[PDB]
Amino acid sequence: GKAKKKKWSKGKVRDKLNNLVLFDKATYDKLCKEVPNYKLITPAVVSERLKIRGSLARAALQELLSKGLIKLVSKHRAQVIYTRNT
Amino acid sequence: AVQISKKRKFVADGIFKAELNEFLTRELAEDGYSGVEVRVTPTRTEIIILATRTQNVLGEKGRRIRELTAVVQKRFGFPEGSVELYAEKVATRGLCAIAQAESLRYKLLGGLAVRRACYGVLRFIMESGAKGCEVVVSGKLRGQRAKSMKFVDGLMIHSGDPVNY
Amino acid sequence: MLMPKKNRIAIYELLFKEGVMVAKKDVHMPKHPELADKNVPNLHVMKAMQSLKSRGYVKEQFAWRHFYWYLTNEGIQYLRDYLHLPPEIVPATLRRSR
Amino acid sequence: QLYWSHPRKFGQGSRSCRVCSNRHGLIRKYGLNMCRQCFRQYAKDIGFIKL
Amino acid sequence: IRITLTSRNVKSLEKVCADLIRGAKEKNLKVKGPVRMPTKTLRITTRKTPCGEGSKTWDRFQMRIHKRLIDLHSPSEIVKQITSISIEPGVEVEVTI
Amino acid sequence: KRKKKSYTTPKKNKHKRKKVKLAVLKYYKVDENGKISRLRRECPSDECGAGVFMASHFDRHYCGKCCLTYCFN
RNA sequence: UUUUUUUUUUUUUUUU
RNA sequence: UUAAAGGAAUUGACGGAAGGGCACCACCAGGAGUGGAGCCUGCGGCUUAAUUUGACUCAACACGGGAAACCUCACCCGGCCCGGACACGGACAGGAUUGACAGAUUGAUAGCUCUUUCUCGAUUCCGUGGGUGGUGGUGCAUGGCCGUUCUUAGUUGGUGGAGCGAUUUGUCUGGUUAAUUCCGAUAACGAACGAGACUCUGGCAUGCUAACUAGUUACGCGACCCCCGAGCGGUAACUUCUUAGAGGGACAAGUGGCGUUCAGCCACCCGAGAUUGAGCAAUAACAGGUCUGUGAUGCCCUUAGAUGUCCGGGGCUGCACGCGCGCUACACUGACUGGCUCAGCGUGUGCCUACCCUACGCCGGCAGGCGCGGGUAACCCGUUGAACCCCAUUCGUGAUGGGGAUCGGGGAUUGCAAUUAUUCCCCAUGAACGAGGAAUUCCCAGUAAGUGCGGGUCAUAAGCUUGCGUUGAUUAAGUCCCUGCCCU
Ligand SMILES: [Mg+2]
Ligand SMILES: [Mg+2]
Ligand SMILES: [Mg+2]
Ligand SMILES: [Mg+2]
Ligand SMILES: [Mg+2]
Ligand SMILES: [Mg+2]
Ligand SMILES: [Mg+2]
Ligand SMILES: [Mg+2]
Ligand SMILES: [Mg+2]
Ligand SMILES: [Mg+2]
Ligand SMILES: [Mg+2]
Ligand SMILES: [Mg+2]
Ligand SMILES: [Mg+2]
Ligand SMILES: [Mg+2]
Ligand SMILES: [Mg+2]
Ligand SMILES: [Mg+2]
Ligand SMILES: [Mg+2]
Ligand SMILES: [Mg+2]
Ligand SMILES: [Mg+2]
Ligand SMILES: [Mg+2]
Ligand SMILES: [Mg+2]
Ligand SMILES: [Mg+2]
Ligand SMILES: [Mg+2]
Ligand SMILES: [Mg+2]
Ligand SMILES: [Mg+2]
Ligand SMILES: [Mg+2]
Ligand SMILES: [Zn+2]
C-alpha cells in the first residue's frame, strides 16, 4: 500500500553506526592501558566511548576484573559498576 | 439417591414459588386473588391461598379446591395428599394492592368507565387502612394516540431501601 | 395421526380417573415429549384435547410451559360421553365430603 | 416420515426457557433456565436482591 | 451425630438456634455451638435491557446462603421430640446420624 | 418492504393418492359346493401375517402390518 | 474580532 | 388578495444579557492514551440466490449479553408432514380411511411420485364457513422494561392573601450547605415527595457469641543436623490470625479563631475511622430502543404448491474501501535461560427436562490417551505453589534476538460433520511498525497505568464483558476560560 503517514517526527540518532565485534591489539592496548585508568567504568560507558560492542565490552572488562585489577562496587540484575583502585 | 446442594434446592423451591402462585391466579382470577403461603412440613406441602370469594374457593361440597390439589400432583411430583389447599378470607379486604388491581380489571370489562372505576377503588383503599396509593393506568383511552393517565391518594415514598416491604 | 383403540379409551380413562392431566408445549418435531402417565408423545395428547376444548368439556389452564386442566359441572353434564362407558360411578373427586 | 433429523443433543437447540420457550438470548444452568429478558421480571417473585 | 442449619434470613436462623437450645439444654445433653460456615453468594449480572439502546447498566443480583452447624450426640427419642417444632418457612433443617 | 409472492410454475399439485379401488374385492372360491380355495398365499407368522393376506407383485409378496416381503430369484 | 444558515401535511375533549 | 395581522400581561425556552453557583461525561498542572501500522470484532459503501434484520449526535458502531460450521434462521436454492379445531351438506365407499418391502426415482433408505396390491377402521375425505400457526408488518396504535432529558436539587398539592383571568405568594433579600441543607426575615401557615435518614458494604474492636469441614499453644511421637533444655516441617485450654451474628463507637463531642443572637467554616488534639464505594430513587415528558423475550396483545398480511413446518446445502465469514472500541507493539526501564517467592470474590455431575471440576499414577516432544479417588461441596480439586515482579546468564542500541499477521508441511481434542472459521501444539515464512498528523476521550489515591485469574454464553471458545486482585505514581485540590448544568 501507500504509507501516507500523517505524522511527522524525524531526527534519528546516528545512521546505524558500526561497532567492533571482536577486539584488536590496537584495542587491546587501548584496553590494558586506560580501561582501568579512568575513574568510573561501566561496560556501557566504554562501549560508546571507544566504539566497542557491549557483549565484547563485558567480555573484556570482566577479564581485567577476573585478575582482580578492577575494583567494582556491586553487581545486580541490570548494572555492574566499576572503579579503579589506586 | 436424591441430593442437590443448597445452591440448587433453594432456587428449585425459589421457582416453585413462582410456578405455584402465578398459575393459581390464572384459574382463580374470578374473585380478588391475593397469594399463597408455602410453609415447610417435611412429609407434606402446606399450601394456603388468600382470596376474596372463599365460596369461589370452596365449591359445591368440596369439589373445586381438592381438584386443584391434584393439578399439582401431576407435574410437581408431590403426590398423595402432601399438597394441601386451604384458604383465607381477606378480612382487611381493602389492603392488598393485588386484588385492588384485580377487581379493577373486571369493572372495566363490562362498561363502568375508567374514571368511575379508579376513583372507586381509591375510595375503597383509602377507607381501608392504607396511607400510600397511586394507581397508574396508561393505555389506549379516548383515541389512538395513547394518553397516559394517573390517580393518587395518601402519601408515597419513592426512594430509600424500605420500598420493598 | 390417530391413536390406536387402546390409547384413546385409556386416556379417556385416566382423565376420568384423576380429573386433571398435565402436558407441555413442545410439538413433536425437534423433541419427543411424552408423559410419565401415557406412553405416546404430544400430537396424540394435543389431538385429544383439541376436541375436548372445542365442545367445552375440560377447561384449560396454562403455566409458563406445562399445561394443566380443570373440570366443571358443565363438563360433567357434558361428559355423558364417558359416563356412558361404565354405569353411574363417579370417582372420589366430585362425590363427597366426609 | 421425516419429522426429526439434526440431533440437537447439545448446542443451541437444547437450552430452553422455563417461562416462555425461547432461545435467542443465552440460557444458564443455575437450577434455573432463563433468558434474562424474563429473568429480571421474575426475580422479584423468586427472591433475588440487588444490594 | 449432627444437625446442619441452612437458611436465608438470619433473624430466623439465630432464633432457630435459640429455639433449638431453649428446647435442648434443660435436658440431659452435651451440646455444641453454632459453627459459622461462610455465607455463600451466587451472583447474577444482567444486561437490564432486552435490546441494545442507551447506556450499558447492569443489574447485579445476589443470594446469601447462611449456614451454621450444631452437634448433638445422644439417644434419638429426644431427636424425635425436637422433631416436633414449628418452623419458619425459609428454613431447611437436615438431620445426620 | 413490498414482498408479494406467487408461483413461477415449475411444479403443480401432484396429488396424494386417490384411493382407486374396485366395487368390493373378492378373493375366495367355492368348489364342490363348499371347498375353500384360497388363491392369494398365506404368510409366515411373524405375529403380523397369521391372518393377513399378501399383495401380488411381479416377484414381491407384501405383508400388511410389518412388510415381511416374500421373495426369491 | 467571526459564531453565517436547515425545506413540510402534520395540536380532539364529556362526566358522578 | 388575506384569516388573520395587532394590543398589554403570564408561564417556558433561548440569550455572544447582567449577579450568584456547580461538574473531571468541562478545563487549567498532569498522566494514560487512541487517532500512525499490524490484527480482531461491530457499522455504512460494493457483490450475490442470500450477503437475515433492529439501533444512525451525546441519548447507535465488542449492542442484541450476537464468541453463530449444522441448529440458532426471520435469507436464498430444493424436499417431507398438518395443528381443515369445529360443524353443515356430500362420494360416507354396498365396511373398501392411511402405511409399506422392493424396482424406479432423486442430495436421500421422501412409499414425494409411478408401477404392483396387502394392512387399517367410521378420528374419516369432499366443498363452505371458520379457527389456528406466523423471529410477518408496525415500537408512528400498544403493556412491561430500558436508558435519557437528569446525577442535578429540584417538584407539587390544600387553605388564606394578590390578579377580571392566565397565573401567583409558600418556592425569599441575606448568611450558609454536596443540596428548596439550615438559621432569620416575610401574606402567608401547615404539610409532602426527592436530598438525607435506610441498606449491602469499605472501615475498627471486645478477653460477647466459638468452631474435629477454621485455628492455636504446649503435651506426645517420630525425622533431620551442630547437638545445648534450643532450631524448620509431618501423627489438655482458648477462639488472638479464617469464619459471622447480637450488641459498641464518629457526633465536629474539647480547645483556638472567623462568625446576625446564629447556620456554619478552618487548624490541632486523642481516636482504626472526622466521611468509603455503592445501591433504591423526585413530579413531568421523548411519538428515544425493543412486536426478534414472552402462553402480553390490537389491527392488516399469510395457511395445504404454506409469510406454519421440519429436513438437506449455502449465506450472515465476501472486499478498491471509510469509521468505531480494543489487543500486542514499536525496545535496553528491555528481549532470552533458569532460580526464587507470596492473592482475593467466585466455579464444579442422575435438576420441572438434557445435563462437571479434578486429586494421584502411567504413556506421549507438546496438545493430549488410559485406570483409580474425591467433590450435590470451609472436607476434596485448594495452606487455589496465580502472574506481574525478583536473583544470576546472554544479547548491546542492531527493523536486531525488538515485532508475530500472512504462508508451507504435519501432529491432537471436542462434534452430526469443522470445508469457504474451528480449538491446541510443533517446525518453518519473519510482514508494516523509528513514539504516531489537524482533533478528541478517561482519570485525585490503593485512584490511574503496567500484570494475572475466575464467572456469563461454552462441545470445542476470549482480544469483549463483569468481578477479583498485585507493583502501586504524576500533578491537583481551584476556576467559569473552553463544553455544559443549577438559582434569581
Ligand atoms: Mg406511552
Ligand atoms: Mg462583525
Ligand atoms: Mg429563565
Ligand atoms: Mg490538559
Ligand atoms: Mg490506547
Ligand atoms: Mg488505528
Ligand atoms: Mg443486514
Ligand atoms: Mg459503542
Ligand atoms: Mg423501531
Ligand atoms: Mg417508541
Ligand atoms: Mg413503548
Ligand atoms: Mg381583586
Ligand atoms: Mg411567581
Ligand atoms: Mg475469631
Ligand atoms: Mg424523581
Ligand atoms: Mg423512534
Ligand atoms: Mg409470539
Ligand atoms: Mg386480536
Ligand atoms: Mg448480520
Ligand atoms: Mg478506523
Ligand atoms: Mg524484528
Ligand atoms: Mg513471537
Ligand atoms: Mg477522545
Ligand atoms: Mg465459568
Ligand atoms: Mg468468563
Ligand atoms: Mg461479543
Ligand atoms: Zn421462554
Side-chain angles (χ1 to χ4, degrees), chain B residues 138-139 146-148:
Chain B
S138 297
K147 180 64 179 173
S148 65

Side-chain angles (χ1 to χ4, degrees), chain A residues 3 5-7 9 16-17 19 47 53-55 58 75-77:
Chain A
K5 55 189 290 184
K6 310 285 188 180
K7 66 158 285 293
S9 294
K16 193 193 286 187
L17 72 99
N19 209 1
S47 183
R53 189 167 289 174
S55 67
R58 287 170 296 159
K75 64 174 286 182
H76 278 282
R77 178 199 283 174

Side-chain angles (χ1 to χ4, degrees), chain B residues 71-158:
Chain B
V71 173
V72 177
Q73 281 179 353
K74 305 298 181 292
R75 191 261 172 92
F76 290 90
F78 289 90
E80 302 299 322
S82 300
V83 177
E84 178 59 32
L85 274 71
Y86 289 99
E88 304 188 5
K89 177 69 176 179
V90 183
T92 61
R93 194 181 174 188
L95 183 63
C96 176
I98 296 170
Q100 303 299 316
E102 186 176 359
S103 291
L104 183 67
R105 301 189 296 171
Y106 298 146
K107 296 184 282 188
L108 296 180
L109 292 169
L112 276 298
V114 193
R115 296 287 185 188
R116 195 179 187 273
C118 293
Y119 293 109
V121 295
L122 278 179
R123 185 177 179 180
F124 191 74
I125 291 159
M126 190 53 66
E127 189 72 28
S128 175
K131 293 307 291 186
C133 192
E134 183 158 358
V135 177
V136 182
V137 179
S138 297
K140 287 171 66 177
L141 296 172
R142 289 167 177 84
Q144 297 292 320
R145 292 177 178 181
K147 180 64 179 173
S148 65
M149 298 172 71
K150 291 168 193 176
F151 299 99
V152 51
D153 277 326
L155 190 66
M156 189 65 74
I157 287 172
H158 293 284

Side-chain angles (χ1 to χ4, degrees), chain E residues 26-81:
Chain E
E26 74 277 21
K27 291 181 182 180
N28 193 357
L29 296 177
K30 294 198 285 181
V31 190
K32 298 295 291 297
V35 180
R36 264 80 65 180
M37 298 292 109
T39 295
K40 310 173 183 64
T41 304
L42 184 67
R43 297 178 176 179
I44 294 173
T45 303
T46 309
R47 180 58 184 165
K48 283 196 184 189
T49 173
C51 67
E53 197 209 3
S55 69
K56 301 185 176 185
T57 308
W58 303 90
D59 269 325
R60 180 182 168 184
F61 296 106
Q62 292 185 358
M63 285 199 291
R64 287 180 181 273
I65 305 167
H66 314 298
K67 193 172 179 182
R68 311 291 175 86
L69 261 77
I70 61 167
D71 295 322
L72 284 171
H73 68 286
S74 290
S76 69
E77 284 288 332
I78 295 170
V79 178
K80 289 183 182 179
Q81 184 175 0

Side-chain angles (χ1 to χ4, degrees), chain F:
Chain F
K1 293 179 183 178
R2 284 164 171 84
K3 300 179 179 182
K4 175 171 74 174
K5 286 186 177 179
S6 182
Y7 301 103
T8 57
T9 323
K11 275 78 69 178
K12 291 176 184 182
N13 297 320
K14 46 180 291 182
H15 59 281
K16 301 173 183 179
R17 186 172 299 272
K18 178 181 178 182
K19 298 304 290 180
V20 48
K21 293 282 279 182
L22 309 178
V24 301
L25 276 79
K26 186 174 173 183
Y27 293 108
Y28 302 155
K29 179 61 186 294
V30 174
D31 282 329
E32 283 180 351
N33 290 318
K35 178 59 181 292
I36 294 166
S37 181
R38 170 67 273 185
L39 193 66
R40 299 166 177 85
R41 190 174 178 177
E42 286 89 358
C43 187
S45 293
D46 50 357
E47 293 290 327
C48 295
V52 170
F53 301 104
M54 281 181 174
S56 60
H57 190 74
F58 185 77
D59 48 357
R60 305 297 188 188
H61 306 292
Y62 178 72
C63 178
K65 295 180 182 180
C66 58
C67 300
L68 183 64
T69 300
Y70 194 70
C71 182
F72 180 65
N73 195 359

Side-chain angles (χ1 to χ4, degrees), chain C residues 28-87:
Chain C
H28 182 80
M29 40 192 73
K31 188 68 177 177
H32 179 272
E34 287 188 358
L35 208 64
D37 292 332
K38 299 299 292 174
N39 201 353
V40 283
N42 196 2
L43 199 155
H44 308 280
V45 173
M46 281 188 176
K47 188 181 177 183
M49 309 308 291
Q50 69 173 353
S51 62
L52 297 176
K53 71 182 75 171
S54 67
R55 299 171 185 173
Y57 287 167
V58 173
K59 301 302 178 188
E60 182 180 1
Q61 298 296 328
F62 191 76
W64 303 111
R65 182 181 289 280
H66 281 80
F67 291 95
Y68 301 100
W69 277 279
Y70 182 84
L71 188 65
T72 317
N73 285 319
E74 286 184 356
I76 295 169
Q77 294 194 6
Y78 282 80
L79 281 173
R80 193 170 66 87
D81 299 327
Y82 202 69
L83 293 174
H84 189 78
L85 272 299

